[PDB]
Assembly symmetry: C2
Homo-oligomer: 305 residues x 2
Amino acid sequence: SGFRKMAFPSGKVEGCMVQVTCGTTTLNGLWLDDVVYCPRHVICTSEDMLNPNYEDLLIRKSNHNFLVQAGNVQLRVIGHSMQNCVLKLKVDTANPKTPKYKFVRIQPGQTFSVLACYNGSPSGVYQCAMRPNFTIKGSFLNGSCGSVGFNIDYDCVSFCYMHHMELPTGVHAGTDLEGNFYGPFVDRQTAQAAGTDTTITVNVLAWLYAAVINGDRWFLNRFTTTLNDFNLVAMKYNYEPLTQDHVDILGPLSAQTGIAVLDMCASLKELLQNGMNGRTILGSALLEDEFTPFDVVRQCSGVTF
Amino acid sequence: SGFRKMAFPSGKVEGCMVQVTCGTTTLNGLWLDDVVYCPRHVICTSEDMLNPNYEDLLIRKSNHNFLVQAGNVQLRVIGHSMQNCVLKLKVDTANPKTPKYKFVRIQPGQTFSVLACYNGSPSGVYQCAMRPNFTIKGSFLNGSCGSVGFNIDYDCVSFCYMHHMELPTGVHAGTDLEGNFYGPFVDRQTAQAAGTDTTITVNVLAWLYAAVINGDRWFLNRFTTTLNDFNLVAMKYNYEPLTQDHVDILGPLSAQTGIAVLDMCASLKELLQNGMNGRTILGSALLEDEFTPFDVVRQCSGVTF
């Protein structure tokens, strides 16, 4: 029993983290097979970030300008290329610690673990979610760029996020491992405001199921609702509309607990309209939306890797 | 910027996790040098746990009764001994992945990372704290026993916790790596109720400093207090008394932010007496007490390992 915000074990990713330095800028890179992936703004000075022309800046760089260090040992760079907002540095040695891996582009609402790194060295690991406005709420200091987000399925690491930017509002933006930003953000120091940070309804419902499984059941009530009626309330409170697809994804948790999805929606509706009255659910005084249905099933069943 | 509940990177500990089976019971063990550490109740059946005589039960076990598996490979057990509530299984092969390590017994209020494991396989990593009543609020299912808690200082893993028991109230109890339980708990399935779960005041204050460093400052007020006056309020709200030692530990955060410790105490006093009025601090609607002062300094400065 007990339910915690849990990250994936980070060892398989720790073995892939390297330091990349170009001129005066140092950040993190991801070393998989004989390629190191990192943010293309490693080629930029602080001045450059206000209005960078990446193709022009890259012309002034050669292979030997990219200093790649794995722990204490230097890697030899034998080619480089830009793909969208990432650089791919071809090195002469395949990483012997390369795990089974895939690159995935995740959808808003999906969760992943972040290995925060500085100078190629891991500092910590935590769980977060791709927000509906395509930001993430991370913990990234200067030098953390190139830190990655990932999920693990048994033996295979699915990399989904590379950190690039902090917005002036303190939230974070980055790319998939093909170098395409999530959402509308760009790797330039300019005015980019995030859209509404809406709540991930299906994740809140999943977490309410986790709460029931673990004995927190005060919020269960005598009511039910419909999708359309629930969604009138979701709109008022800046929650994502619940779809039939979401109802289907919650099917396993509904079956396990015997609580119909629409009955849990009616519990959520009452929590939205009346608040929690100073009570807590799974140690939280607000409705948590960074556990997916699959996260809840995984943690409640003990799936390993 | 951003502040997250962050666990230590778990790779160094993942490389030490093994499966231990004795008769019909399987749990996790920790393989360091040529010793595997695990809970002594691996020798117990479900019946045994109601009133176990461990010395008598252990007499019926030999080295070959302890099946130790590291991934897919079996380890040869060449001796075994009981130390308090742990078993030490001497194996014929030193773990080649043994990190630099120490065994530490932590004090209440201190935090650590847990690598939840099942059948010797890591499932997830999360941060928690030794509560003042000597329980922890973890996420442990059947088979998680022997999972460990740890801190990392650069290259050295300090192991501080091994999981043994879930209390009927759903909180968790375990030992240090010398096999001594934290608090009054015993490895028997009996009535053990936890004492008051008091709030770790110095950690709440540290987290308020983290909030100010990251821009959340609405709770700062025009007031100050004294230690004795603050402690009258702490007692009323089941907070640990704040000592001069705690004030000294918060010195670095006070210096960095320019907010005197007693001024932050007065902010906390107002938060206790008036609540948060539906507002949040660092994404939380309650006062968080599982970040130590050293955790805040570490995460706010980017310390790596």
